[PDB]
Structure 1
Amino acid sequence: HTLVWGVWVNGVDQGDGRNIYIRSPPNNNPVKNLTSPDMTCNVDNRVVPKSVPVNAGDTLTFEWYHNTRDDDIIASSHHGPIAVYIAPAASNGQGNVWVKLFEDAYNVTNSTWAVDRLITAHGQHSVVVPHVAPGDYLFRAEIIALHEADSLYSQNPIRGAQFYISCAQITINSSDDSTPLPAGVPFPGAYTDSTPGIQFNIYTTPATSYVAPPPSVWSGALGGSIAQVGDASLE
Protein backbone atom coordinates (compact mmCIF):
# COMPACT_ATOMS: atom_id res chain seq x y z
CA HIS A 1 0.00 0.00 0.00
CA THR A 2 1.97 2.97 -1.37
CA LEU A 3 1.52 6.15 -3.46
CA VAL A 4 3.65 8.77 -5.21
CA TRP A 5 3.94 12.07 -3.27
CA GLY A 6 5.82 13.96 -6.03
CA VAL A 7 9.00 14.02 -8.07
CA TRP A 8 12.45 15.61 -7.98
CA VAL A 9 14.28 16.91 -11.06
CA ASN A 10 18.11 16.96 -10.75
CA GLY A 11 17.71 16.75 -6.95
CA VAL A 12 15.24 19.69 -6.83
CA ASP A 13 11.94 18.79 -5.21
CA GLN A 14 9.00 19.76 -7.49
CA GLY A 15 6.67 19.75 -4.44
CA ASP A 16 3.50 17.86 -3.59
CA GLY A 17 2.18 16.50 -6.92
CA ARG A 18 -0.89 14.62 -5.60
CA ASN A 19 -3.89 15.41 -7.91
CA ILE A 20 -1.69 18.18 -9.40
CA TYR A 21 0.89 16.56 -11.74
CA ILE A 22 0.34 12.93 -10.50
CA ARG A 23 -2.88 11.20 -11.65
CA SER A 24 -3.38 10.11 -8.04
CA PRO A 25 -5.87 7.36 -7.21
CA PRO A 26 -8.17 7.95 -4.19
CA ASN A 27 -6.15 5.63 -1.95
CA ASN A 28 -3.11 3.35 -1.79
CA ASN A 29 -4.92 0.03 -2.47
CA PRO A 30 -3.37 -2.14 -5.21
CA VAL A 31 -4.64 -2.93 -8.67
CA LYS A 32 -4.72 -6.73 -9.13
CA ASN A 33 -7.00 -7.54 -12.12
CA LEU A 34 -4.62 -7.91 -15.10
CA THR A 35 -7.36 -7.10 -17.67
CA SER A 36 -8.68 -4.03 -15.70
CA PRO A 37 -8.65 -0.61 -17.33
CA ASP A 38 -7.16 0.34 -13.89
CA MET A 39 -3.86 -1.27 -15.04
CA THR A 40 -3.13 1.80 -17.30
CA CYS A 41 -2.74 4.53 -14.66
CA ASN A 42 -4.62 3.19 -11.59
CA VAL A 43 -8.28 3.74 -10.80
CA ASP A 44 -8.59 7.54 -11.50
CA ASN A 45 -6.82 8.09 -14.84
CA ARG A 46 -7.64 11.62 -16.00
CA VAL A 47 -5.69 14.73 -17.02
CA VAL A 48 -4.45 16.69 -13.94
CA PRO A 49 -3.72 20.40 -14.17
CA LYS A 50 0.13 20.45 -14.24
CA SER A 51 2.96 18.67 -16.10
CA VAL A 52 6.52 18.86 -14.69
CA PRO A 53 9.07 20.35 -17.08
CA VAL A 54 12.26 18.37 -17.72
CA ASN A 55 14.96 18.12 -20.37
CA ALA A 56 16.52 14.98 -21.89
CA GLY A 57 19.26 13.74 -19.54
CA ASP A 58 17.72 15.13 -16.35
CA THR A 59 17.49 12.80 -13.35
CA LEU A 60 13.77 12.30 -12.61
CA THR A 61 13.16 10.89 -9.13
CA PHE A 62 9.77 9.41 -8.07
CA GLU A 63 9.08 9.67 -4.32
CA TRP A 64 6.67 7.14 -2.77
CA TYR A 65 5.08 7.08 0.71
CA HIS A 66 2.62 4.91 2.65
CA ASN A 67 0.44 7.17 4.84
CA THR A 68 2.51 10.37 5.26
CA ARG A 69 5.57 11.75 3.46
CA ASP A 70 8.93 9.99 4.17
CA ASP A 71 7.38 7.34 6.48
CA ASP A 72 7.82 3.56 6.22
CA ILE A 73 7.13 3.95 2.41
CA ILE A 74 5.55 0.47 1.90
CA ALA A 75 5.09 -2.51 4.16
CA SER A 76 8.37 -4.56 4.25
CA SER A 77 6.33 -7.71 3.40
CA HIS A 78 5.66 -6.28 -0.11
CA HIS A 79 8.88 -7.66 -1.74
CA GLY A 80 8.99 -7.35 -5.51
CA PRO A 81 10.31 -5.44 -8.52
CA ILE A 82 10.05 -1.85 -9.74
CA ALA A 83 9.62 -0.71 -13.36
CA VAL A 84 9.10 2.65 -15.08
CA TYR A 85 7.38 3.02 -18.46
CA ILE A 86 6.86 6.04 -20.73
CA ALA A 87 4.03 6.81 -23.20
CA PRO A 88 3.12 9.95 -25.17
CA ALA A 89 0.46 11.84 -23.16
CA ALA A 90 -1.97 12.19 -26.10
CA SER A 91 -2.48 8.40 -25.95
CA ASN A 92 -3.94 8.74 -22.40
CA GLY A 93 -2.06 5.42 -21.91
CA GLN A 94 -4.29 3.58 -24.42
CA GLY A 95 -3.03 1.28 -27.13
CA ASN A 96 0.46 -0.16 -27.83
CA VAL A 97 2.29 2.79 -26.26
CA TRP A 98 4.20 1.88 -23.06
CA VAL A 99 8.00 1.65 -23.44
CA LYS A 100 10.05 0.37 -20.47
CA LEU A 101 12.77 2.72 -19.23
CA PHE A 102 13.77 0.84 -16.02
CA GLU A 103 13.63 -2.56 -14.34
CA ASP A 104 15.03 -3.70 -10.97
CA ALA A 105 13.81 -7.01 -9.57
CA TYR A 106 16.08 -9.03 -7.22
CA ASN A 107 19.70 -7.96 -6.78
CA VAL A 108 21.81 -11.10 -6.34
CA THR A 109 24.89 -9.06 -5.29
CA ASN A 110 22.98 -7.28 -2.39
CA SER A 111 20.46 -10.18 -1.72
CA THR A 112 17.60 -7.59 -1.85
CA TRP A 113 14.47 -6.89 -3.82
CA ALA A 114 13.91 -3.46 -5.39
CA VAL A 115 11.11 -2.74 -2.87
CA ASP A 116 13.53 -3.48 0.03
CA ARG A 117 15.98 -0.89 -1.41
CA LEU A 118 13.15 1.59 -2.12
CA ILE A 119 12.38 1.64 1.64
CA THR A 120 16.08 2.26 2.45
CA ALA A 121 16.03 5.08 -0.21
CA HIS A 122 13.13 6.91 1.59
CA GLY A 123 10.81 6.00 -1.28
CA GLN A 124 13.04 7.39 -4.07
CA HIS A 125 13.91 5.78 -7.40
CA SER A 126 15.11 7.63 -10.50
CA VAL A 127 15.39 7.44 -14.28
CA VAL A 128 17.40 9.51 -16.78
CA VAL A 129 14.93 11.33 -19.02
CA PRO A 130 15.42 9.77 -22.50
CA HIS A 131 16.18 11.65 -25.74
CA VAL A 132 12.67 11.32 -27.18
CA ALA A 133 10.70 13.97 -29.10
CA PRO A 134 9.87 17.08 -27.08
CA GLY A 135 6.30 17.03 -25.82
CA ASP A 136 4.03 15.74 -23.10
CA TYR A 137 4.48 12.27 -21.66
CA LEU A 138 3.13 9.96 -18.99
CA PHE A 139 5.76 8.26 -16.81
CA ARG A 140 4.13 5.13 -15.31
CA ALA A 141 5.98 3.93 -12.21
CA GLU A 142 4.97 0.39 -11.19
CA ILE A 143 5.81 -1.52 -8.02
CA ILE A 144 4.74 -5.17 -8.04
CA ALA A 145 4.33 -6.61 -4.54
CA LEU A 146 4.70 -10.41 -4.72
CA HIS A 147 3.86 -11.50 -1.13
CA GLU A 148 0.46 -13.06 -2.32
CA ALA A 149 1.56 -13.81 -5.93
CA ASP A 150 1.73 -17.64 -5.52
CA SER A 151 -1.96 -17.44 -6.59
CA LEU A 152 -3.33 -15.87 -9.72
CA TYR A 153 -5.85 -13.11 -8.92
CA SER A 154 -8.01 -14.84 -11.60
CA GLN A 155 -8.02 -18.04 -9.40
CA ASN A 156 -8.35 -16.33 -6.00
CA PRO A 157 -9.20 -12.61 -6.05
CA ILE A 158 -8.18 -12.21 -2.37
CA ARG A 159 -4.57 -12.89 -3.53
CA GLY A 160 -2.43 -12.25 -6.62
CA ALA A 161 0.40 -9.97 -7.59
CA GLN A 162 -0.28 -6.40 -6.45
CA PHE A 163 0.35 -3.43 -8.81
CA TYR A 164 1.03 -0.02 -7.26
CA ILE A 165 0.78 2.14 -10.42
CA SER A 166 1.36 5.91 -10.56
CA CYS A 167 1.33 8.05 -13.71
CA ALA A 168 3.21 11.36 -13.60
CA GLN A 169 2.62 14.11 -16.21
CA ILE A 170 6.07 15.12 -17.50
CA THR A 171 6.77 17.65 -20.28
CA ILE A 172 10.11 17.08 -22.11
CA ASN A 173 11.25 20.53 -23.37
CA SER A 174 14.87 20.30 -24.58
CA SER A 175 15.62 16.98 -26.37
CA ASP A 176 17.68 16.21 -29.49
CA ASP A 177 15.35 13.20 -30.17
CA SER A 178 18.42 10.99 -30.80
CA THR A 179 16.28 8.00 -29.65
CA PRO A 180 12.74 8.40 -31.06
CA LEU A 181 10.17 6.59 -28.90
CA PRO A 182 8.89 3.41 -30.61
CA ALA A 183 5.50 1.74 -30.20
CA GLY A 184 5.29 -0.17 -26.94
CA VAL A 185 2.98 -2.49 -25.04
CA PRO A 186 -0.57 -2.03 -23.83
CA PHE A 187 -1.70 -1.79 -20.18
CA PRO A 188 -3.98 -3.62 -19.61
CA GLY A 189 -2.76 -6.41 -21.91
CA ALA A 190 1.04 -6.76 -21.58
CA TYR A 191 0.69 -8.85 -18.38
CA THR A 192 -1.36 -12.02 -18.49
CA ASP A 193 -1.78 -15.11 -16.24
CA SER A 194 1.04 -16.87 -18.21
CA THR A 195 3.51 -13.92 -18.20
CA PRO A 196 6.78 -14.68 -16.35
CA GLY A 197 7.01 -12.93 -12.99
CA ILE A 198 3.23 -12.51 -12.39
CA GLN A 199 2.63 -15.85 -10.57
CA PHE A 200 5.59 -16.33 -8.24
CA ASN A 201 5.81 -17.95 -4.77
CA ILE A 202 8.39 -15.98 -2.71
CA TYR A 203 8.02 -18.53 0.16
CA THR A 204 8.98 -21.59 -1.99
CA THR A 205 10.76 -20.24 -5.09
CA PRO A 206 14.20 -18.63 -4.66
CA ALA A 207 14.33 -14.93 -5.63
CA THR A 208 17.52 -15.81 -7.60
CA SER A 209 15.12 -17.60 -10.07
CA TYR A 210 12.71 -14.61 -10.44
CA VAL A 211 12.24 -13.28 -14.00
CA ALA A 212 10.49 -9.90 -14.11
CA PRO A 213 7.57 -9.55 -16.50
CA PRO A 214 8.50 -8.48 -20.02
CA PRO A 215 8.81 -6.30 -21.94
CA SER A 216 12.59 -5.85 -21.77
CA VAL A 217 14.04 -2.39 -21.09
CA TRP A 218 14.17 -0.33 -24.32
CA SER A 219 17.53 0.12 -26.05
CA GLY A 220 16.97 3.95 -25.83
CA ALA A 221 16.77 3.89 -22.04
CA LEU A 222 19.64 5.68 -20.24
CA GLY A 223 19.37 4.00 -16.81
CA GLY A 224 18.34 4.84 -13.29
CA SER A 225 18.80 4.06 -9.60
CA ILE A 226 17.04 3.21 -6.37
CA ALA A 227 18.63 5.74 -4.00
CA GLN A 228 17.74 8.81 -1.96
CA VAL A 229 18.41 11.90 -4.21
CA GLY A 230 16.77 14.44 -1.97
CA ASP A 231 16.32 14.87 1.74
CA ALA A 232 12.63 15.70 2.44
CA SER A 233 13.59 16.28 6.18
CA LEU A 234 15.57 19.48 5.21
CA GLU A 235 12.35 21.21 4.02
Structure 2
Amino acid sequence: HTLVWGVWVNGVDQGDGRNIYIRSPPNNNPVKNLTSPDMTCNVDNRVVPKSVPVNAGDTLTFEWYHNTRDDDIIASSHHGPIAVYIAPAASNGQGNVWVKLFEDAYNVTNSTWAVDRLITAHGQHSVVVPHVAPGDYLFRAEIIALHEADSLYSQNPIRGAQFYISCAQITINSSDDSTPLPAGVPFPGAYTDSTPGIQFNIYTTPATSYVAPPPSVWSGALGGSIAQVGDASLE
Protein backbone atom coordinates (compact mmCIF):
# COMPACT_ATOMS: atom_id res chain seq x y z
CA HIS A 1 0.00 0.00 0.00
CA THR A 2 1.70 3.06 -1.40
CA LEU A 3 0.77 6.19 -3.47
CA VAL A 4 2.65 8.93 -5.39
CA TRP A 5 3.09 12.20 -3.53
CA GLY A 6 4.54 14.17 -6.47
CA VAL A 7 7.51 14.42 -8.76
CA TRP A 8 10.89 16.10 -8.95
CA VAL A 9 12.44 17.39 -12.19
CA ASN A 10 16.22 17.57 -12.42
CA GLY A 11 16.35 17.27 -8.63
CA VAL A 12 13.85 20.05 -8.01
CA ASP A 13 10.65 19.21 -6.14
CA GLN A 14 7.53 20.18 -8.16
CA GLY A 15 5.39 20.17 -5.00
CA ASP A 16 2.45 18.04 -3.79
CA GLY A 17 0.81 16.67 -6.93
CA ARG A 18 -2.00 14.67 -5.35
CA ASN A 19 -5.17 15.26 -7.39
CA ILE A 20 -3.29 18.17 -9.05
CA TYR A 21 -0.97 16.61 -11.60
CA ILE A 22 -1.26 13.05 -10.33
CA ARG A 23 -4.56 11.22 -11.14
CA SER A 24 -4.65 10.04 -7.54
CA PRO A 25 -7.02 7.30 -6.28
CA PRO A 26 -8.67 7.93 -2.91
CA ASN A 27 -6.41 5.48 -1.03
CA ASN A 28 -3.40 3.18 -1.30
CA ASN A 29 -5.36 -0.09 -1.92
CA PRO A 30 -3.81 -2.34 -4.54
CA VAL A 31 -5.41 -3.05 -7.96
CA LYS A 32 -5.54 -6.83 -8.62
CA ASN A 33 -7.99 -7.46 -11.44
CA LEU A 34 -5.88 -7.70 -14.61
CA THR A 35 -8.86 -7.18 -16.88
CA SER A 36 -10.24 -4.11 -15.09
CA PRO A 37 -10.11 -0.54 -16.45
CA ASP A 38 -8.51 0.25 -13.09
CA MET A 39 -5.27 -1.28 -14.53
CA THR A 40 -4.83 1.84 -16.76
CA CYS A 41 -4.48 4.62 -14.13
CA ASN A 42 -6.06 3.18 -11.00
CA VAL A 43 -9.61 3.66 -9.69
CA ASP A 44 -10.12 7.42 -10.26
CA ASN A 45 -8.83 8.08 -13.76
CA ARG A 46 -9.80 11.62 -14.78
CA VAL A 47 -8.04 14.72 -16.01
CA VAL A 48 -6.51 16.69 -13.17
CA PRO A 49 -5.91 20.41 -13.53
CA LYS A 50 -2.07 20.62 -13.90
CA SER A 51 0.58 18.98 -16.09
CA VAL A 52 4.30 19.09 -15.07
CA PRO A 53 6.56 20.81 -17.65
CA VAL A 54 9.69 18.95 -18.70
CA ASN A 55 12.15 18.77 -21.64
CA ALA A 56 13.75 15.75 -23.25
CA GLY A 57 16.82 14.71 -21.27
CA ASP A 58 15.45 15.87 -17.99
CA THR A 59 15.32 13.53 -14.98
CA LEU A 60 11.69 12.94 -13.82
CA THR A 61 11.50 11.48 -10.34
CA PHE A 62 8.37 9.86 -8.85
CA GLU A 63 8.11 10.02 -5.10
CA TRP A 64 6.03 7.37 -3.32
CA TYR A 65 4.74 7.15 0.25
CA HIS A 66 2.63 4.99 2.47
CA ASN A 67 0.62 7.15 4.91
CA THR A 68 2.65 10.37 5.13
CA ARG A 69 5.49 11.82 3.03
CA ASP A 70 8.88 10.17 3.43
CA ASP A 71 7.60 7.52 5.85
CA ASP A 72 8.19 3.76 5.44
CA ILE A 73 7.07 4.15 1.79
CA ILE A 74 5.65 0.63 1.27
CA ALA A 75 5.56 -2.41 3.56
CA SER A 76 8.80 -4.45 3.40
CA SER A 77 6.81 -7.60 2.70
CA HIS A 78 5.80 -6.19 -0.77
CA HIS A 79 8.87 -7.49 -2.68
CA GLY A 80 8.51 -6.96 -6.40
CA PRO A 81 9.42 -5.09 -9.59
CA ILE A 82 8.96 -1.51 -10.70
CA ALA A 83 8.17 -0.21 -14.20
CA VAL A 84 7.36 3.11 -15.88
CA TYR A 85 5.44 3.51 -19.07
CA ILE A 86 4.49 6.46 -21.24
CA ALA A 87 1.55 7.18 -23.46
CA PRO A 88 0.17 10.33 -25.17
CA ALA A 89 -2.43 12.11 -23.11
CA ALA A 90 -4.95 12.15 -26.01
CA SER A 91 -5.27 8.31 -25.60
CA ASN A 92 -6.50 8.65 -22.01
CA GLY A 93 -4.53 5.42 -21.61
CA GLN A 94 -6.83 3.47 -23.92
CA GLY A 95 -5.56 1.33 -26.74
CA ASN A 96 -2.17 -0.03 -27.61
CA VAL A 97 -0.38 3.07 -26.41
CA TRP A 98 1.83 2.26 -23.41
CA VAL A 99 5.55 2.22 -24.02
CA LYS A 100 7.96 1.00 -21.41
CA LEU A 101 10.71 3.37 -20.32
CA PHE A 102 12.05 1.58 -17.24
CA GLU A 103 12.18 -1.88 -15.61
CA ASP A 104 13.87 -3.01 -12.41
CA ALA A 105 13.01 -6.42 -10.78
CA TYR A 106 15.73 -8.22 -8.82
CA ASN A 107 19.33 -7.06 -8.46
CA VAL A 108 21.59 -10.11 -7.94
CA THR A 109 24.64 -8.14 -6.76
CA ASN A 110 22.79 -6.43 -4.01
CA SER A 111 20.32 -9.28 -3.45
CA THR A 112 17.49 -6.75 -3.46
CA TRP A 113 14.19 -6.35 -5.21
CA ALA A 114 13.21 -2.99 -6.81
CA VAL A 115 10.75 -2.44 -3.93
CA ASP A 116 13.47 -2.96 -1.35
CA ARG A 117 15.61 -0.27 -2.95
CA LEU A 118 12.60 2.03 -3.34
CA ILE A 119 12.27 2.09 0.43
CA THR A 120 15.99 2.83 0.78
CA ALA A 121 15.55 5.59 -1.82
CA HIS A 122 12.81 7.29 0.33
CA GLY A 123 10.23 6.45 -2.34
CA GLN A 124 12.13 7.95 -5.25
CA HIS A 125 12.75 6.46 -8.65
CA SER A 126 13.36 8.20 -12.01
CA VAL A 127 13.37 8.14 -15.74
CA VAL A 128 15.07 10.38 -18.26
CA VAL A 129 12.52 12.06 -20.45
CA PRO A 130 12.83 10.71 -24.03
CA HIS A 131 13.12 12.64 -27.33
CA VAL A 132 9.47 12.09 -28.31
CA ALA A 133 7.06 14.62 -29.85
CA PRO A 134 6.41 17.68 -27.77
CA GLY A 135 2.98 17.52 -26.17
CA ASP A 136 0.97 16.17 -23.21
CA TYR A 137 1.67 12.68 -21.84
CA LEU A 138 0.76 10.28 -19.12
CA PHE A 139 3.58 8.59 -17.22
CA ARG A 140 2.32 5.36 -15.57
CA ALA A 141 4.47 4.22 -12.67
CA GLU A 142 3.72 0.61 -11.51
CA ILE A 143 4.88 -1.31 -8.55
CA ILE A 144 4.01 -5.05 -8.45
CA ALA A 145 3.99 -6.48 -4.94
CA LEU A 146 4.41 -10.33 -5.16
CA HIS A 147 3.81 -11.50 -1.55
CA GLU A 148 0.51 -13.19 -2.56
CA ALA A 149 1.34 -13.81 -6.20
CA ASP A 150 1.55 -17.64 -5.69
CA SER A 151 -2.15 -17.42 -6.45
CA LEU A 152 -4.03 -15.84 -9.38
CA TYR A 153 -6.60 -13.20 -8.55
CA SER A 154 -8.82 -14.59 -11.30
CA GLN A 155 -8.87 -17.96 -9.49
CA ASN A 156 -8.73 -16.67 -5.88
CA PRO A 157 -9.78 -13.04 -5.44
CA ILE A 158 -8.43 -12.85 -1.93
CA ARG A 159 -4.84 -13.32 -3.21
CA GLY A 160 -2.84 -12.47 -6.33
CA ALA A 161 -0.24 -9.99 -7.54
CA GLN A 162 -0.87 -6.48 -6.36
CA PHE A 163 -0.53 -3.40 -8.60
CA TYR A 164 0.22 0.05 -7.27
CA ILE A 165 -0.38 2.23 -10.35
CA SER A 166 -0.04 5.97 -10.57
CA CYS A 167 -0.43 8.20 -13.57
CA ALA A 168 1.30 11.60 -13.77
CA GLN A 169 0.34 14.28 -16.26
CA ILE A 170 3.60 15.47 -17.92
CA THR A 171 4.02 18.09 -20.63
CA ILE A 172 7.12 17.65 -22.82
CA ASN A 173 8.02 21.12 -24.10
CA SER A 174 11.49 21.11 -25.69
CA SER A 175 12.26 17.97 -27.70
CA ASP A 176 13.54 17.42 -31.22
CA ASP A 177 11.32 14.34 -31.70
CA SER A 178 14.27 12.33 -32.85
CA THR A 179 12.90 9.13 -31.21
CA PRO A 180 9.21 9.37 -31.97
CA LEU A 181 7.10 7.13 -29.75
CA PRO A 182 6.57 3.52 -31.12
CA ALA A 183 3.59 1.22 -30.78
CA GLY A 184 2.71 0.37 -27.20
CA VAL A 185 0.71 -2.20 -25.14
CA PRO A 186 -2.76 -1.88 -23.67
CA PHE A 187 -3.54 -1.69 -19.94
CA PRO A 188 -5.74 -3.53 -19.16
CA GLY A 189 -4.64 -6.28 -21.59
CA ALA A 190 -0.90 -6.57 -21.55
CA TYR A 191 -0.77 -8.62 -18.34
CA THR A 192 -2.64 -11.98 -18.34
CA ASP A 193 -2.67 -14.99 -16.01
CA SER A 194 0.03 -16.66 -18.19
CA THR A 195 2.29 -13.63 -18.40
CA PRO A 196 5.78 -14.23 -17.00
CA GLY A 197 6.10 -12.57 -13.57
CA ILE A 198 2.40 -12.33 -12.66
CA GLN A 199 2.17 -15.74 -10.87
CA PHE A 200 5.35 -16.37 -8.95
CA ASN A 201 6.29 -17.76 -5.57
CA ILE A 202 8.88 -15.56 -3.93
CA TYR A 203 9.10 -17.88 -0.93
CA THR A 204 10.40 -20.96 -2.83
CA THR A 205 11.65 -19.81 -6.22
CA PRO A 206 15.00 -18.03 -6.32
CA ALA A 207 14.55 -14.33 -7.13
CA THR A 208 17.40 -14.67 -9.70
CA SER A 209 14.87 -16.79 -11.50
CA TYR A 210 12.20 -14.07 -11.58
CA VAL A 211 11.25 -12.71 -15.01
CA ALA A 212 9.32 -9.39 -14.96
CA PRO A 213 6.28 -9.09 -17.21
CA PRO A 214 6.96 -7.91 -20.74
CA PRO A 215 7.00 -5.63 -22.73
CA SER A 216 10.71 -5.00 -22.80
CA VAL A 217 12.07 -1.49 -22.24
CA TRP A 218 11.88 0.58 -25.48
CA SER A 219 15.35 1.06 -27.09
CA GLY A 220 14.61 4.81 -27.25
CA ALA A 221 14.32 5.01 -23.47
CA LEU A 222 17.10 7.25 -22.08
CA GLY A 223 17.77 5.97 -18.64
CA GLY A 224 16.38 5.53 -15.18
CA SER A 225 17.15 4.49 -11.58
CA ILE A 226 15.86 3.82 -8.09
CA ALA A 227 17.70 6.36 -5.95
CA GLN A 228 16.95 9.39 -3.84
CA VAL A 229 17.47 12.65 -5.76
CA GLY A 230 16.14 14.97 -3.14
CA ASP A 231 15.57 15.42 0.55
CA ALA A 232 11.92 15.92 1.38
CA SER A 233 12.67 16.55 5.06
CA LEU A 234 14.28 19.90 4.00
CA GLU A 235 11.04 20.93 2.19
For the aligned pair, the TM-score class normalised by the smaller chain equals: over 0.9
Three-state SS of the structure 2 residue aligned to 1:75 is coil
Q: Superposition RMSD on alpha carbons, in Å?
A: 0.3
CA distance in 1, matches of 2:57, 2:4: 22
SS at match of 1:141: strand
Match of 2:52 in 1: 52
User: Unaligned regions of 5+ residues in structure 2, if any?
Assistant: none
| Other structure's SS at 1:197 match | coil
> Any runs of at least 4 consecutive aligned residues in structure 1 with deviations exceeding 2 A, and if so which?
none
Distance, in Å, in 1 between the alignment partners of 2:106 and 2:62 is 20
1:132, distance to aligned residue in structure 2 (A): 0.2
1:208-235 alpha-carbon deviations (Å, 9 max, x no partner): 0000000000010011010000000111
**Match of 2:205, SS?**
coil
Deviation track 1:149-207 (CA, whole Å, cap 9, x = no partner) reads: 00000111010000000000000000011100012000000000000000000011110
Deviation at 1:37, TM superposition (A): 0.4
What's the % identity of the aligned pairs?
A: 100
Q: How many residues were matched structurally? A: 235
Post-superposition Cα deviations, 1:72-102, rounded to whole Å, max 9, x if no partner, equal 0000000000000000000000000000000
SS at the partner of 1:40?
helix
SS of the aligned residue for 2:71 comes to coil
DSSP 3-state at the match of 1:233: helix
Tell me what 2:142 maps to.
142
Provide the residue aligned with 1:181 in structure 2. Answer: 181
* Distance (whole Å) between structure 1 residues aligned to residue 50 and residue 198 of structure 2: 33
- Per the alignment, residue 114 of structure 2 pairs with 114
Q: What runs of 5+ residues in structure 1 fail to find an aligned partner?
A: none
- d(CA) in 1 for partners of 2:223 and 2:104? 11
State the Cα distance separating 1:118 from its structure 2 match: 0.1
CA distance in 1, matches of 2:93, 2:195: 20
Q: Matches of 1:208 and 1:220 in 2, distance apart?
A: 26
Whole-Å Cα distance in 2 between the matches of residues 11 and 100 of structure 1? 22
**2:161 corresponds to:** 161
Equivalent-residue separation in structure 2 for 1:79 and 1:112 (angstroms): 9
Task: Tell me how far apart the structure 1 counterparts of residues 48 and 150 of structure 2 sit (CA, whole Å).
Answer: 36
User: In structure 2, how many angstroms separate the alpha carbons of the residues matched to 1:233 and 1:36?
Assistant: 37
1:49-85 Cα offsets, whole Å, 9 max, x none, are: 0000000000000000000000000000000000000
Paired with 2:212 and 2:2, the residues of 1 have a C-alpha distance of 20
1:78-157 aligned within 5 A: 78-157=78-157
Q: Following TM superposition, by how much is the alpha carbon of 1:140 offset from its aligned partner in structure 2, in angstroms? A: 0.1
